[PDB]
């Protein structure tokens, strides 16, 4: 069911001058994130974070300290250019964690492997009122 | 005397219409129907629909006690 | 002076005070199925004619204290 | 000839390295403080910065 | 008036009358060539197509690129034929890209 | 971690999916609609509350929503 | 590769078909509108021309004629001063009697008691005493009759109908193609060496056969009317020669380059007239020849069809070094392709290049009887003041748009924008520090003082006989200027201004032209707080222009666009996180900033240089020195300052500046309006304006074009734009009103 | 022609004569019957 | 400022003082415990209420005093 790709270490990154954009004590201590994509050829993109870089000719990877931020550079690769990407991340543990996409197709393309989250089977003028849920913990759209 | 009392006739009006406007207005209103189940004070709804900034109840009293300040200067 | 401004000062924030906590009344321990069709709910059901109203009003005495405020002026 | 790099020539992290930052005479300047003495006894650290300061 | 609309389509190729002051695919539904749509408000791909002659109003659309309108593409829910233009059915994705 | 809900109003346009910044939405099978599809909110402990999704929602009143709830260093985009 | 005359014939028909359709560039404009905010966006992108289409050709043509329409409208605007000095004025009154007379230019209808406002300026005229300082350019130009005012009239008028007929000329029938406006070294060549060479060239011409003769005239006491008019002086030579006598020789010094023999009319002394209060005109003479000279020779560097000269990219592409990689290469093809960056440049130099001209103008008055017309000096400072820091912040705007929709590094890469794209962060933290410390350093001596001043220890507050803060450097500096004549300037012989020193007080009529300008410790204080203030809004402009395409809290901001309301209250809220949003925060701080050094200006002003001279040479100020003791303190400010000078604006009622008065109360009226939009949001003024609506349905009386409350960032703009006319408009009234009054 | 009598009853046109209208009666009006805090006639 | 200055333009200051400070000898010996963010909307919308009306309360009560005491009639 999709073995997710495993992150290949020793893949080169762009070819960047340095920023004051880039990671910083949170990577160190909670987690960060890794972006891979193939690019057919060495060309220039914009930096998530500051200027420009120089994707080279192969594997391509390089690493975020935001998922919001990686998707960005997800979209900008996949729309300007025709770049498939993914991306994971990892804890301070050396934990990899493959993120996107998840079952190896976009999510805005239907696949019949995945399961309903946080669907709720009525229009939403039907939530009860808060009175209802008084002094109990939950919320009344939670339900 | 005069003057200044249509003045505060109109203080009072505007504190009430404000402060009624939000009070009749927070379970839900055109912009936004189901104001109920987000609480009483909220940020807004996002810049979604032509943009929901101090759509709250919080919000109008927010609003209404500037002129109650006013009013009572 | 300094009696009188006072408690008109705490007066006009204890209003204030009032009427949003009748707005957190609304949002959280009103009822509807409850209140029907009594007082309360038939207050909330023609908000727009009292909030119009109040918005003719206060339209009014601004206009027209500005207005002859201004004229003297 | 380029004199700014990326930190110890990687580009991701977020600083850079410059004259003021990485300069041979400043580096050592800044490695030779107390705060920056790691493998000396917290206490006379504390005692030359508490009498400077 | 009602200008013959030639619609190409994994289906096949159909024609079907229609008023200039309606959309092709509403009318469409009237005879029953099943076409793809999914808002019906111009605000989305599902129900693109592109054109081969005439071409159609650009009035009732919105949510497009400053170019969708003259380079081909366009939607079939907000669209009036003005002449008995030829269109292209189920083309989403090529419009995607 | 916000709250993201799906109501089944959705049309399954897919506009909003195409719109979060943090791929907290997707398409699943349905049966209720013409499209056969419906989105879903699997990993909502990565929704920022940018709220995008709800400006992409051609339904009336809307069919995806976001309420705001405890605050994360994911919740809160914050590098640092 | 050479260059030429490259046009188009009539890519335009002129017509009224669009003029019947309300926003014809705008496609979803053009359809029609549903709702009430089509018309507020009607306007706000009726001259984005960038956004109507994406054609460079196209820009640029519409920006040329739209160039020609706006010239247009300057003269008409000048020959209505013209007129409005030629029929409605007491300008030959006033020229008969300078310094009794009062300057107006315009009279008011007798309509509803408003002639009030007709007031007593003498001359035997009842009007509005004007501040334009026309009458002075006038006199320095030497017009004496009215009938040269309607001739100036009526040429302008001519001119701004040729500028209106070539605005439609060049966009309907010929219009330039893109290759004729990416010419920039010939444009070059021509601004520099023809418009600001010639043009300082002719009228140096003009200085010399008009404004000399004439003036000498005026000021040796001749009746302005029983003067030569000056064609004579160009007819008959002797009339020259009998004033300046080596205009006998008549340009044979000019070619035996004996020039010397000119020294007559061609002077180098410096100073003030001290007959008219104003710089001598023999040195303005010579200023505007070295001047053409100067600019004639600096029209001949860049390259355009002969193989001499400067090819600007060789020049940009030449400089660059080990700190900063492959510098300058790339820009010339960034300067030509977009013209948001042109106008960000042109913009700051402008604004940088008017408050020069206010700081000289007030300095080194080059217009005579101008100094001592204390209301004309007092407006032209603040006005030239304001321009010029509306025009900075114009500069970070388009800056900002400059980043957002045409910077691409893809195509277009130039070194140094990148990598100070990526170094923003130490940029923006070293000038927020710098911010902060400026900020403690020189208003908290101001609340030092106070509290200082209000503990009654007046001894440990920072003033000039408790804790002196003397600004040394500048003392220095003027004390170098006031010794330089003679030292090292020797073909000087007054100090380039009064304010440098050596004593030399001028006066005309009884009243204080110049005198030296004493520096203390309140100056040091003051200068240091408008530091800190300039520093803070180049902050804010520089911090919205370098994270303006992406930051750490939204990492595609560009996508975005330039201008935007925000992303949702997501990441814990991003309220106003757009490029538009900072250049909206930068006008309050410019106009913090201007009001600071306008007030400065007009204290010391009143306090340490105008004021009556009298017999002895003894010299009353408007204020005995309270700008040293008093300003020192905030007290000081609000009470010797805005209560004291705020008297003249109240008690103007029942005379003829009662219309500053009421401009003083209605321009905090609408001040304090642009509150409403500046604190509120546009959701409850929705959900008001949906009852409202209910209202009017009730009564079939609902309009169909849906009513909608503004947007997010037309209310942000609506709240700006009433709080700076507010401001700068009290502002406006009270520094009129009091140095009217008082001057 | 039939363009620019369109043109001249757009909204901001219409509205500017009709305001300009307004305010010649009105000036016109005070100019003869000036200071006039009442109705004097009946 | 809380009332005119709004989230989004504070928040991206404060982060880039965080850069700073993390950046910098001897200082980046100390550590936060709390990532500093900049104040929510509800609550900037409340501090700039504070302000607006403790300065309020505070200048018109130190004008009604010293105008009374000072004449004491
Ligand atoms: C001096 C500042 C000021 C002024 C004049 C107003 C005026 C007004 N406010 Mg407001 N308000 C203010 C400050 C101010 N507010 C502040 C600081 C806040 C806190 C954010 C609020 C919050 C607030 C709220 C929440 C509400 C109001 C409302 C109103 C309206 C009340 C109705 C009325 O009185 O009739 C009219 C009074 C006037 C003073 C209008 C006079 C202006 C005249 C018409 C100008 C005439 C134009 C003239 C022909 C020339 C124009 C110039 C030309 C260039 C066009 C009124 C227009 C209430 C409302 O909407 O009423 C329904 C409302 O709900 N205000
Ligand atoms: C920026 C330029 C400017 C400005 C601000 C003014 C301002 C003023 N002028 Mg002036 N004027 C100007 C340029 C200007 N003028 C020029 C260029 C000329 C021709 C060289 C004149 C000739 C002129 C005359 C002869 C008179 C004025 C008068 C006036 C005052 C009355 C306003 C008015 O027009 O009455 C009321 C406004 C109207 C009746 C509507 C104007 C409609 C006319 C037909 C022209 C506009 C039509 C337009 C093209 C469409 C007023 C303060 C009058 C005055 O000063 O009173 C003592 C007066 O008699 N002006
Ligand atoms: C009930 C109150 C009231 C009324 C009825 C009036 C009425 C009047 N006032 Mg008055 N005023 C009032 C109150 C009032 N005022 C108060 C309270 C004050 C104290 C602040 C004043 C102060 C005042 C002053 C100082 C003046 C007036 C003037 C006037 C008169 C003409 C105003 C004018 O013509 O504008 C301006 C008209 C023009 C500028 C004409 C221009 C015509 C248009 C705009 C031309 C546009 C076309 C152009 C070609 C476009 C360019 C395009 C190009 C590219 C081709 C008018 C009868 C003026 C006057 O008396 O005239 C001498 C005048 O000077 N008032
Ligand atoms: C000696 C030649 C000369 C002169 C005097 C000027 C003068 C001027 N240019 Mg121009 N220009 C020139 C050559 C020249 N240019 C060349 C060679 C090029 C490139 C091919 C350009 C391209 C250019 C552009 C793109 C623009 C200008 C603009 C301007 C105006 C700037 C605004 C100003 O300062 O107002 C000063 C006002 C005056 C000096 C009033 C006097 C106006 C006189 C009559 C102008 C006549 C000079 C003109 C070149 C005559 C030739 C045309 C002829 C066939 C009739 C100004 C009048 C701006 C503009 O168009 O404004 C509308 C602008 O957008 N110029
Ligand atoms: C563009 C500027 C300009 C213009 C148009 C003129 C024009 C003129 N100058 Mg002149 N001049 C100028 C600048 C100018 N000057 C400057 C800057 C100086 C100072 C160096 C002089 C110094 C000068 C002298 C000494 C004389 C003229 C004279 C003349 C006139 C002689 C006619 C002729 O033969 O030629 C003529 C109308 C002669 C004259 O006065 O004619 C009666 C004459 O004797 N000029
Ligand atoms: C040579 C100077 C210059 C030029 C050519 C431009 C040109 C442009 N600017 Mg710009 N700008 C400038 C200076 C300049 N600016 C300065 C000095 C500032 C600082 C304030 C700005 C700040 C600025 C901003 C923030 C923006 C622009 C924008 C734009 C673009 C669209 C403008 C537009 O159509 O809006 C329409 C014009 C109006 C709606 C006029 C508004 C009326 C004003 C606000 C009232 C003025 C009151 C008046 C003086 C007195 C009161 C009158 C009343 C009482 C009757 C356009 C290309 C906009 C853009 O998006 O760029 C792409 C944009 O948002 N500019
Ligand atoms: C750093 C902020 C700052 C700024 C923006 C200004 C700005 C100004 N100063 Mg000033 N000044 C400053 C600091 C500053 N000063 C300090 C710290 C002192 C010593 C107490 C002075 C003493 C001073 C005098 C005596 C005079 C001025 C004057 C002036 C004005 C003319 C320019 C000038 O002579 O500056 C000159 C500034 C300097 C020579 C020192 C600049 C600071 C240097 C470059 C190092 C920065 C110091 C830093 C904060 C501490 C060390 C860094 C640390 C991290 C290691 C001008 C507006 C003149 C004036 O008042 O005009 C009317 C005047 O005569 N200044
Ligand atoms: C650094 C301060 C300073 C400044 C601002 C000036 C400024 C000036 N000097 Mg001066 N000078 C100075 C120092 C200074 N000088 C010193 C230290 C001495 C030796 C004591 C002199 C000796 C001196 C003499 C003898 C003369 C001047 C003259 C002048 C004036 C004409 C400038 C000039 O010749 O064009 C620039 C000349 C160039 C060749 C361009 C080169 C650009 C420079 C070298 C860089 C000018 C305002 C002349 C004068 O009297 O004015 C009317 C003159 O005769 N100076
Ligand atoms: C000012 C009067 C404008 C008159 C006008 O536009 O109508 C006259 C015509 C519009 O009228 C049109 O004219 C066309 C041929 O020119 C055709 O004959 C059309 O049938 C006719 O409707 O426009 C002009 O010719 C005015 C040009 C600009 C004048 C300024
Ligand atoms: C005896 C006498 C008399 C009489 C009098 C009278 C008749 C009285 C009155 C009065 C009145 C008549 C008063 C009142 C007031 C009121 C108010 C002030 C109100 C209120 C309300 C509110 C505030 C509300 C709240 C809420 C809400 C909002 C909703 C929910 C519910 C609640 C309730 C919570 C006279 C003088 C003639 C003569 C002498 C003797
Ligand atoms: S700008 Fe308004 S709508 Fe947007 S996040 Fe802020 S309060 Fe909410
Ligand atoms: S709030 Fe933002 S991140 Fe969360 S689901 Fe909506 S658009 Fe996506
Ligand atoms: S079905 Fe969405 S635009 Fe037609």
Same mark, same amino acid.
């Given at each position: 069911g999709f073995t997710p790709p495993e992150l290949d270490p020793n893949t080169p990154s762009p070819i960047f001058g340095g920023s004051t954009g880039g990671l910083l004590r949170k990577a160190q201590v909670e987690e960060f994130y890794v972006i891979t994509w193939e690019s057919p050829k060495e060309q220039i993109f914009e930096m998530p974070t500051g200027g420009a870089a120089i994707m080279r000719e192969g594997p391509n990877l390089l690493k975020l300290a935001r998922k919001e931020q990686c998707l960005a550079l997800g979209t900008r690769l996949r729309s300007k250019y025709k770049i498939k990407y993914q991306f994971y991340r990892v804890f301070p543990s050396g934990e990899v964690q493959y993120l996107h996409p998840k079952d190896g197709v976009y999510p805005e393309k239907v696949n019949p492997g995945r399961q309903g989250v946080g669907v709720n089977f009525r229009s939403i003028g039907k939530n009860v009122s808060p009175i209802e849920v008084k002094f109990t913990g939950k919320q009344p759209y939670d339900l | 005397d005069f003057l200044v009392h249509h003045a505060i006739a109109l203080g009072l009006h505007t504190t009430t219409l404000i402060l009624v406007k939000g009070a009749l207005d927070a379970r839900g209103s055109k912009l936004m129907p189901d104001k109920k189940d987000f609480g009483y004070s909220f940020p807004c709804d996002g810049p979604g629909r032509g943009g929901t900034c101090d759509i709250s109840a919080w919000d109008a009293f927010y609003l209404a006690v500037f002129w109650m300040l006013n009013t009572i200067g | 002076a300094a009696l009188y401004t006072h408690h008109q000062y705490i007066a006009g924030f204890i209003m204030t005070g009032a009427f949003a906590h009748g707005a957190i009344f609304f949002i959280r321990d009103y009822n509807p199925e409850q209140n029907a069709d009594n007082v309360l709910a038939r207050m909330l059901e023609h908000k727009e004619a009292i909030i119009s109203h109040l918005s003719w009003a206060s339209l009014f005495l601004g206009f027209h204290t500005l207005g002859l405020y201004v004229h003297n002026d | 000839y380029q004199v700014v790099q990326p930190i110890n020539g990687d580009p991701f992290i977020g600083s850079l390295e410059t004259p003021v930052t990485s300069s041979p005479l400043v580096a050592w300047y800044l490695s030779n403080l107390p705060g920056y003495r790691t493998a000396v006894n917290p206490l006379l650290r504390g005692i030359e910065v508490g009498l400077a300061h | 008036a009602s200008y013959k609309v030639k619609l190409v389509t994994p289906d096949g190729t159909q024609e079907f009358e229609c008023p200039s002051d309606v959309y092709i695919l509403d009318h469409a539904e009237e005879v029953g060539i099943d076409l793809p749509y999914s808002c019906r408000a111009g605000s989305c791909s599902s129900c693109a197509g592109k054109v081969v002659g005439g071409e159609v109003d650009q009035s009732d659309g919105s949510f497009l690129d400053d170019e969708q309108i003259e380079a081909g593409f366009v939607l079939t829910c907000v669209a009036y034929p003005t002449s008995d233009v030829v269109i292209e059915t189920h083309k989403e994705e090529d419009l995607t890209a | 971690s916000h709250s993201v809900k799906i109501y089944d109003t959705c049309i399954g346009c897919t506009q909003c999916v195409r719109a979060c910044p943090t791929d907290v939405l997707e398409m699943i099978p349905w049966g209720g609609c013409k499209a056969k599809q419906i989105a879903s909110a699997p990993r909502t402990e990565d929704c920022v509350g940018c709220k995008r999704c709800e400006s992409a929602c051609p339904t009336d009143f809307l069919s995806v929503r976001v309420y705001l709830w405890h605050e994360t260093t994911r919740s809160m985009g914050l590098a640092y | 590769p050479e260059v030429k005359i490259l046009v188009d014939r009539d890519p335009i028909k002129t017509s009224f078909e669009q003029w019947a359709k309300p926003g014809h560039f705008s496609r979803t404009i053009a359809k029609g509108p549903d709702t009430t905010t089509w018309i507020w966006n009607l306007h706000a992108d009726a001259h984005d021309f960038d956004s109507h289409t994406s054609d460079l050709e196209e820009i640029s043509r519409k920006v040329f004629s739209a160039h020609f329409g706006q010239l247009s409208i300057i003269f008409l !605007?000048?020959?209505?001063?013209?007129? /409005?000095?030629?029929?409605?004025?007491?300008?030959?009154? !006033?020229?008969?009697?300078?310094?009794?007379?009062?300057?107006?230019?315009?009279?008011?209808?007798?309509?509803?008691?408003?002639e009030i406002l007709n007031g007593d300026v003498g001359g035997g005229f009842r009007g509005i005493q004007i501040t334009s300082g026309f009458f002075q350019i006038w006199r320095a130009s030497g017009i004496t009759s009215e009938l040269q005012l309607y001739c100036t009239a009526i040429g302008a008028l001519v001119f701004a109908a040729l500028m209106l007929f070539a605005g439609w000329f060049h966009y309907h029938k010929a219009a330039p193609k893109l290759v004729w406006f990416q010419d920039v070294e010939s444009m070059l060549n021509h601004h520099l060496a023809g418009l600001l060479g010639l043009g300082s060239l002719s009228w140096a011409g003009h200085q010399v056969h008009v404004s000399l003769p004439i003036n000498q005239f005026l000021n040796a006491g001749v009746d302005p009317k029983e003067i030569p008019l000056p064609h004579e002086f160009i007819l008959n030579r002797d009339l020259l020669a009998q004033l300046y006598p080596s205009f006998a020789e008549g340009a044979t010094p000019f070619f035996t380059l004996n020039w010397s023999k000119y020294a007559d009319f061609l002077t180098f002394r410096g100073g003030?007239?001290?007959?008219?209060?104003?710089? !001598?005109?023999?040195?303005?003479?010579?200023?505007?020849?070295?001047?053409?000279?100067?600019?004639?020779?600096?029209?001949?560097?860049?390259?355009?069809?002969?193989?001499?000269?400067?090819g600007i990219k060789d020049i940009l592409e030449a400089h660059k070094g080990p700190f900063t990689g492959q510098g300058h290469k790339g820009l010339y093809e960034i300067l030509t392709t977009?013209?948001?960056?042109?106008?960000?440049?042109?913009?700051?130099?402008?604004?940088?290049?008017?408050?020069?001209?206010?700081?000289?103008?007030?300095?080194?008055?080059?217009?005579?009887?101008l100094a001592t017309d204390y209301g004309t000096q007092l407006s032209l400072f603040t006005h030239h003041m304001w321009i010029g820091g509306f025009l900075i912040v114009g500069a970070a705007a388009h800056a900002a748009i400059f980043m957002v929709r045409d910077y691409d590094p893809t195509?277009?890469?130039?070194?140094?924008?990148?990598?100070?794209?990526?170094?923003?962060?130490?940029?923006?933290? /070293?000038?927020?520090?710098?911010?902060?410390?400026?900020?403690?350093?020189?208003?908290?001596?101001?609340?030092?003082?106070?509290?200082?001043?209000?503990?009654?220890?007046?001894?440990?507050?920072?003033?000039?006989?408790?804790?002196?803060?003397?600004?040394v450097f500048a003392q220095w500096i003027q004390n170098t200027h006031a010794l330089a004549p003679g030292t090292t300037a020797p073909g000087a012989t007054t100090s380039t201004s009064l304010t440098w020193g050596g004593g030399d007080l001028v006066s005309v009529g009884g009243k204080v032209a110049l005198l030296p300008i004493p520096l203390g410790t309140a100056d040091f204080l003051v200068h240091h707080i408008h530091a800190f203030t300039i520093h803070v809004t180049v902050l804010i402009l520089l911090k919205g222009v370098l994270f303006a395409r992406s930051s750490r809290l939204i990492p595609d901001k560009a996508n975005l666009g330039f201008r935007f309301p925000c992303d949702g209250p997501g990441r814990?809220?991003?309220?106003?996180?757009?490029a538009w949003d900072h250049v909206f925060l930068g006008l309050f701080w410019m106009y913090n900033a201007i009001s600071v050094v306008i007030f400065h200006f007009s204290w010391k002003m009143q306090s340490d240089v105008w004021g009556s001279i009298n017999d002895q040479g003894v010299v009353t100020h408007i204020t005995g020195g309270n700008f040293a003791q008093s300003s020192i303190t905030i007290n000081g400010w609000l009470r010797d300052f805005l209560w004291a000078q705020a008297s003249q604006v109240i008690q103007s009622y029942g005379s003829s500046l009662s219309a500053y008065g009421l401009f003083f109360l209605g321009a905090h009226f609408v001040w304090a309006f642009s509150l409403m939009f500046l604190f509120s949001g546009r959701g409850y003024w929705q959900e008001l304006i949906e009852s409202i609506v209910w209202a009017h349905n009730k009564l079939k009386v609902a309009p169909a074009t849906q009513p909608r409350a503004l947007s997010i960032v037309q209310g942000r703009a609506v709240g700006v734009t009433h709080y700076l006319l507010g401001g700068i408009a009290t502002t406006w009234a009270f520094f009129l009103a009091r140095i009217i009054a008082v001057g | 022609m039939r363009d620019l009598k369109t043109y001249l009853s757009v909204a901001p046109v219409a509205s500017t004569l009709w305001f300009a209208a307004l305010a010649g009666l009105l000036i016109e009006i005070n100019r003869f019957f000036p200071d006039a805090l009442t109705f004097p006639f009946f | 400022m809380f009332l005119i200055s709004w989230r989004g333009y504070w928040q991206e200051l404060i982060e880039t003082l965080a850069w700073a400070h993390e950046r910098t000898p001897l200082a980046n010996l100390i550590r936060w415990r709390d990532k500093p963010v900049a104040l929510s909307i509800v609550q900037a919308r409340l501090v700039g209420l504070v302000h607006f009306s403790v300065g309020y309360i505070f200048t018109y009560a130190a004008f009604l005093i010293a105008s009374t005491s000072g004449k004491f009639g």
């Open positions: - | - | - | - | - | - | !605007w000048l020959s209505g001063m013209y007129f /409005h000095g030629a029929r409605f004025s007491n300008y030959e009154a !006033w020229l008969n009697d300078p310094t009794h007379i009062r300057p107006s230019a315009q009279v008011v209808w007798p309509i509803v008691g408003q003030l007239d001290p007959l008219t209060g104003g710089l !001598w005109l023999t040195d303005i003479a010579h200023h505007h020849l070295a001047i053409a000279i100067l600019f004639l020779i600096a029209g001949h560097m860049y390259r355009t069809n002969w193989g001499i000269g400067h977009s013209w948001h960056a042109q106008l960000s440049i042109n913009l700051a130099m402008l604004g940088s290049l008017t408050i020069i001209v206010a700081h000289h103008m007030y300095a080194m008055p080059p217009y005579p009887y195509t277009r890469y130039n070194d140094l924008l990148d990598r100070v794209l990526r170094h923003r962060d130490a940029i923006i933290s /070293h000038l927020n520090w710098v911010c902060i410390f400026l900020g403690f350093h020189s208003f908290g001596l101001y609340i030092h003082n106070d509290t200082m001043s209000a503990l009654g220890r007046p001894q440990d507050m920072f003033s000039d006989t408790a804790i002196q803060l003397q600004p814990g809220g991003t309220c106003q996180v757009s | - | -």
